[PDB]
């Protein structure tokens, strides 16, 4: 209550706030949540953090409706330190095209606009960097990486940067594709980041720490060798080659949670191991009692105490009927996982039903699918589609309704074309839907990322299905993650150099300890690729 500095965090109670609070505590601070203006007072507050995730209007409506506008402005006028994170940063602007009708605090007189997806995937999901500058602050290091996850940004041009400079604003710039945008701002007592420091490992914690202690340490004195190695060369649009570690979560006989089919601290510990070994993100495949007491939620909550990178959970995110008969829609189930520590949810089977219905309605959605409800509330960046396809040959496009493509490898009868058929219920059942049609429908519906598995390569340890990746990349404009088949570092290299995969996921190879995320990163690094090394 006074035995340690107190940090007040404005909580609109929507989204994952576990990471931010755990980071602050981990830094030696006590967290005081502020769900209402009644929960804090100007003079009694020395450190205020405004975290925000999701649709711009959603967050700003919520915030302003609870009466935080005046309290926030007054606090800012008090001259005391305030930190905005992600939407907290956007809230400082005039508004956002994401929610046309919305209005911000307008400290910066222009709106956030959507990234250009003609040249790159949108949303931006990954590790970008601040452009070297003389006016960086709070320790922002151009040679480190921070995690960004957003479709909208304060996109810059010469005119806006000049006005900002004349307005006395210090701007940390970043570039995604050919577009420059505000990664961070600083003017007097106001500080805000577009990236999630709490989701940016040690580099992130340093930023929060530098803020809480109000200090801008100089960046390390790297050697010219190190700089050339650590600098952003803007390959892959400026994002590092994202390495994802995945683990299964099962309930054995005794009813305990384990990762292996034969054995809840195991899943937790492994996730921690992964994080410690460089994983840029950890995915839990929930394959395991009232919703409130789901064991998976505890794994996430426990993992979130020390794992400061994005967490993804797939499985069970759908409309459900609780133990008391209460009907709980997908949206509320997701919110439960998010508030528990998850940053993204993976939709599998329902994604196929959604896509199918989507075409039935003539390429439109009814806004009732988990994809639509969750993405509209939390943004596309929060919804991941897990796809489980299987190659199917045909003599020509004339043999099927689904889009096919000329393959370099002929079929049993010499068929030179093929499409990938999707499956559901753990790949136990097939559907008359191609992956081309499935991904395009889900994207239209609001999915922000595609987890591209491959039934045929799963468990093989012989590399990814490269034509599949390219096939899906031709289909959608959202990030595509290569999964299934990864066995050795070389497979990651092949995917990043021979295909347009936006990330690579590994499971068994990391689980069996054959290699670590770092082994893979060292390899890629040694081969000219850019990887997060924190
Ligand atoms: Ni105290």
């Amino acid at each position: 209550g006074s035995h340690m500095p107190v940090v007040h965090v404005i909580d609109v109670e929507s989204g994952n706030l576990q990471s931010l609070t755990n980071a602050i505590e981990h830094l030696g601070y006590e967290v005081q949540l502020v769900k209402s203006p009644k929960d804090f007072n100007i003079s009694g507050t020395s450190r205020l953090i405004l975290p925000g995730v999701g649709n711009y209007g959603h967050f700003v409506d919520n915030l302003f409706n609870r009466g935080f506008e005046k309290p926030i402005r007054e606090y800012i006028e008090s001259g005391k330190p305030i930190m905005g994170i992600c939407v907290g940063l956007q809230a400082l602007f005039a508004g956002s095209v994401e929610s046309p009708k919305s209005t911000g605090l307008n400290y910066i007189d222009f709106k956030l606009s959507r990234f250009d997806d003609s040249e790159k995937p949108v949303p931006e999901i990954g590790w970008n960097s601040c452009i070297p500058s003389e006016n960086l602050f709070f320790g922002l290091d151009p040679y480190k990486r921070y995690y960004f996850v957003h479709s909208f940004a304060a996109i810059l041009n010469s005119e806006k940067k000049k006005n900002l400079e004349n307005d006395g604003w210090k701007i940390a710039k970043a570039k995604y594709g050919s577009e420059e945008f505000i990664a961070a701002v600083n003017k007097n007592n106001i500080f805000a980041t577009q990236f999630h420091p709490e989701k940016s490992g040690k580099a992130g914690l340093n930023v929060i720490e530098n803020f809480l202690k109000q200090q801008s340490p100089p960046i390390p004195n790297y050697s010219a060798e190190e700089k050339e190695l650590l600098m952003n060369d803007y390959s892959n649009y400026g994002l590092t080659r994202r390495i994802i570690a995945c683990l299964d979560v099962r309930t054995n006989d005794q009813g305990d949670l384990v990762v292996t089919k034969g054995d809840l601290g195991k899943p937790v510990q492994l996730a921690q191991k992964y994080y410690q070994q460089g994983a840029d993100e950890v995915t839990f495949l929930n394959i395991t009692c009232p919703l409130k007491d789901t064991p998976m939620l505890e794994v996430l909550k426990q993992a979130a105490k020390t794992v400061f990178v994005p967490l993804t959970v797939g499985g069970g995110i759908k409309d459900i009927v609780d133990v008391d008969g209460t009907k709980i829609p997908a949206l509320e189930v997701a919110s439960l996982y998010f508030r528990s520590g998850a940053d993204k949810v993976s939709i599998g089977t329902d994604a196929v039903y959604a896509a199918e219905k989507y075409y039935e309605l003539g390429n439109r959605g009814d806004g009732t699918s988990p994809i639509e409800t969750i993405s509209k509330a939390y943004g596309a960046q929060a919804v991941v589609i897990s796809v489980d396809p299987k190659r199917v040959y045909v003599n020509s496009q004339a043999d099927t309704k689904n889009k096919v493509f000329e393959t370099e490898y002929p079929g049993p009868n010499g068929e030179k074309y093929c499409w990938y058929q999707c499956t559901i219920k753990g790949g136990r059942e097939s559907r008359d839907l191609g992956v081309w049609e499935l991904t395009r429908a889900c994207e239209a519906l609001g999915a922000g990322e595609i987890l591209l598995n491959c039934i045929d390569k799963d468990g093989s340890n012989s590399g990814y299905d490269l034509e599949l990746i390219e096939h899906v990349k031709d289909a959608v404009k959202i990030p595509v993650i290569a999964s299934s088949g990864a066995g050795v570092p070389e497979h990651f290299e092949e995917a990043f150099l021979k295909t347009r995969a936006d990330a690579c996921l590994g499971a068994g190879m990391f689980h069996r300890g054959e290699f670590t995320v770092n082994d893979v990163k060292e390899y890629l690094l040694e081969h000219g690729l850019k990887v997060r090394m924190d």
Side-chain angles (χ1 to χ4, degrees), residues 207-225:
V207 176
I208 295 168
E209 176 165 50
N210 288 329
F211 168 67
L212 295 177
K213 287 180 179 179
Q214 290 290 290
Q215 47 170 39
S216 301
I219 73 174
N221 201 298
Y222 304 102
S223 59
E225 321 284 295

Side-chain angles (χ1 to χ4, degrees), residues 1-6 30:
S2 54
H3 62 310
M4 51 179 80
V6 177
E30 181 179 297

Side-chain angles (χ1 to χ4, degrees), residues 310-359:
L311 292 67
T312 294
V313 58
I317 314 303
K318 54 186 177 183
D319 298 319
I320 69 174
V321 182
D322 216 337
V323 170
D324 53 32
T326 306
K327 287 188 177 180
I328 306 179
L331 173 60
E332 299 180 55
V333 186
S335 301
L336 191 51
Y337 281 84
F338 289 158
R339 297 174 64 63
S340 296
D343 296 294
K344 290 186 291 183
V345 283
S346 173
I347 307 299
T349 292
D350 272 321
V352 183
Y353 294 154
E356 294 181 316
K357 184 183 294 183
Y358 173 82
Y359 293 109

